[PDB]
Amino acid sequence: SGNKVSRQSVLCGSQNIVLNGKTIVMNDCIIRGDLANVRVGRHCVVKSRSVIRPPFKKFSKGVAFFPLHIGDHVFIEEDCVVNAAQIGSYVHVGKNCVIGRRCVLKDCCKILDNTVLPPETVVPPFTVFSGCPGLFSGELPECTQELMIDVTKSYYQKFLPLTQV
């Protein structure tokens, strides 16, 4: 209802998605999370050119990557070709991001620009793991990160109204 999403998106399995109100999705984000479930929350956001596919089958012979997960008031910039990333509350991805398979990116995280996380690359909380390969670049603040994520949810619900119908 409140999630005033765009109209030029792409996905399959209408019930497999999970996007609560006050969210803001963008166009061209071909998220084919049809087979496995796609989990998200309220006031979250994503951007264009981000084909966030789901993790895996979730029911293979041995182990298999589960459906999906996302957090509230999070943000995923442009060209975020993410895959299999359980996002916590107040997470913040960057432009041209690459989420590795089976990555439980904890709360208050901060991805970088063109960062290629490897498969099964766990990211700590309030620690901006970045670089080309996996590398704990620096330590991100707590208060400023929570305020920035709340401001992100605010700007996402205060800009999505125009040019999206």
- Give the β-pairing of 10-11 and 30-31: parallel
Stretch of 37-45, 110-118, 147-155, 156-164 contacting another protein, by CB under 8 A: 110-118
The reply on whether position 32 binds another protein by CB under 8 A is yes
Chosen residue from 35, 42, 95, 125 binding another protein by CB under 8 A: 35
Closest CA to 56 of 103, 118, 105: 103
Closest CA to 48 of 163, 145, 146: 163
24: Cα separation from own chain's centroid: 12
Chosen residue from 4, 81, 95, 124 binding another protein by CB under 8 A: 81
SS3 at position 139: strand
The reply on whether position 141 binds another protein by CB under 8 A is no
Instruction: Report residue 75: phi and psi, to 5°.
Output: -145, 140
The reply on whether position 7 binds another protein by CB under 8 A is no
The reply on whether position 150 binds another protein by CB under 8 A is no
Chosen residue from 53, 102, 110, 153 binding another protein by CB under 8 A: 53
Residues found near another protein in the complex (CB under 8 A): 10, 12-13, 30, 32, 34-35, 51, 53, 56-57, 60-61, 64, 81, 83, 98, 114, 116, 118, 132-133, 138
